[PDB]
């Protein structure tokens, strides 16, 4: 069938009219920031949140920067924590590009969203960001830390979009390998899971749908320069064996119909199912990649967030019984 | 890619099956009912609900039996109404086969679910059921009727699975033609939308996925014997023009990955998008058709109901929005 995009996503697809691969990453990031600040709709209907900037200090003196958002009037309430990893191909993206998505998730889920400002590539390479994210989850799951930011570590979930979905997936595999049972759910929004740039979705949507093959290649080349390293399952979790993926957290995998990453996201969901996990995998029709890193939120983006919230609410209900509490 | 079914759906798919197309419909129905009753789990973990049975007297002297379920302690609370059309290929299905699904929707959405026991085929043909379902929606939307069963007609949504998805869709189109503005949303769960038995999903899942191409042909044969009538958009709404499908109610279209009807459901969603409607279309991976007409509810079935409920709540909020 021929893809019929929804109006918003069509608009975005045609709007993308500049090659970021021709510029240095700092320039691209500054242009991105400007495109958010200069969007006249960027602040319209933006929910109000209580925001806190938090630094966690590692052993040697290094820092992980966390941005924590929560609904207003939750000052003495303990909330479920959502540790969020943003997309941007490991090279761009920020609390600003994902402000819309994060503020909406915060007030719809009534959760503390813990946004990890991880180190971007190429200034660092794989696996530095991954280790920062794992360290952030480990920090949040620790009882005294969770008390300090009024969240309930028994409801911790990881969530992320695109390259952030990759990070969510592999942080889960990694925590499993360290014998930790601290992540209760993973939400993967059109994740990067492999480096095969000739899957059918890659062929069909290689150009003119905002996220391009060219851009994916550029991202991978900055993140993992030496191609052999791409064989690590912590880079490309689709290459993992079924046994590698057993006993992972309850998962929601969301894919876009018109997206180069569609096939690998759906194949990763099939592998998670083979491995006996609790997996919900859904493809949304008529949308493209990138609806969650913009100044505004498409109608379908909003439906998707309502879905994610319903699923999170079920996840937390599952926990609450058999009690913790 | 090769389809990976989830365990529950795999087991359902692998099960010992009898060719229903070899038996008369009435026998199929009694056997179906028996299949629900003799399941020891059909009643275990079933939500408790307040149930009321209501008869509609149609203008032509025939009756529609309505089964209305709402949550306990809601006798004197006004609730949103969901008018529900069950699946079964227009030939089978009942308040019993969908009891599990309906009770769960009832307590999860905390809504009044109005289950239409419409007349089955071949005892009647197209379009008798469609006419009954439309009359049921008009009845609920009528203010004194809505007040009598404590529902808020400003939130009326239609919902249906399979052939019941078909009915939901076309009821909307019919209501549009009659200039009625009483449906605020439509939920189409892997709906029948066309009669092309040779789409890609029909070919790929023709056998061994519970719902078969054989069974669909049998269904269409009982529902619409005279093939000329299959050209009606009220039989196959996929055949409607884009202009025909304009300004329909806000829609949620859910398809199953391993299902013969997958392609036409998704094609109908694309047409609804082309026509400028508010449409959410989702394909759930690793499942088959028919998870909503059984004694139990699969894990994915449960997730899907949670999805629908979230979507319904957004629908109900959008409708009440201007009251501010």
Numbering used by the authors:
A (entry chain A): 3 to 327
B (entry chain B): 3 to 326
Copy text from the publication.
We recently characterized two novel HSL family esterases from the thermophilic fungus Rhizomucor miehei: RmEstA and RmEstB. The physiological substrates of RmEstA and RmEstB detected in our studies have been found to be short-chain triacylglycerol, linalyl acetate, and butyl butyrate. Both of these enzymes belong to the α/β hydrolases and exhibit distinct substrate specificities: RmEstA shows highest activity toward longer-chain esters, whereas RmEstB favors hydrolysis of shorter-chain esters. Both of the esterases were composed of a core catalytic domain and a cap domain, exhibiting the typical α/β-hydrolase fold. A classical catalytic triad consisting of Ser161 (Ser164 in RmEstB) as the nucleophile, His292 (His291 in RmEstB) as the proton acceptor/donor, and Asp262 (Asp261 in RmEstB) as the residue stabilizing the His was identified in RmEstA (RmEstB).
The four monomers were arranged as two canonical dimers to further form a tetramer via hydrogen bonding network. The substrate-binding pocket of RmEstB extended ∼11 Å from the protein surface to the catalytic residue Ser164. This deep hydrophobic cleft was funnel-shaped and surrounded by four α-helices (α1, α2, α6, and α8) and the loop regions (His88–Gly91 and Ile290–Ala297). The substrate-binding pocket of RmEstB is funnel-shaped with ∼11 Å from the protein surface to the catalytic residue Ser164, a distance that just fits the acyl chains of substrates with carbon chain lengths shorter than C4. Esters with acyl chain lengths longer than C4 therefore hardly bind to the substrate-binding site due to steric hindrance. The structural differences between the substrate-binding pockets of the two esterases suggest that several aromatic residues (Phe222 and Trp92) block the substrate-binding pocket in RmEstB, which might contribute to the restriction in carbon chain lengths of the ester substrates. Phe222 and Trp92 are located in the center of the substrate-binding pocket, close together (4.1 Å).
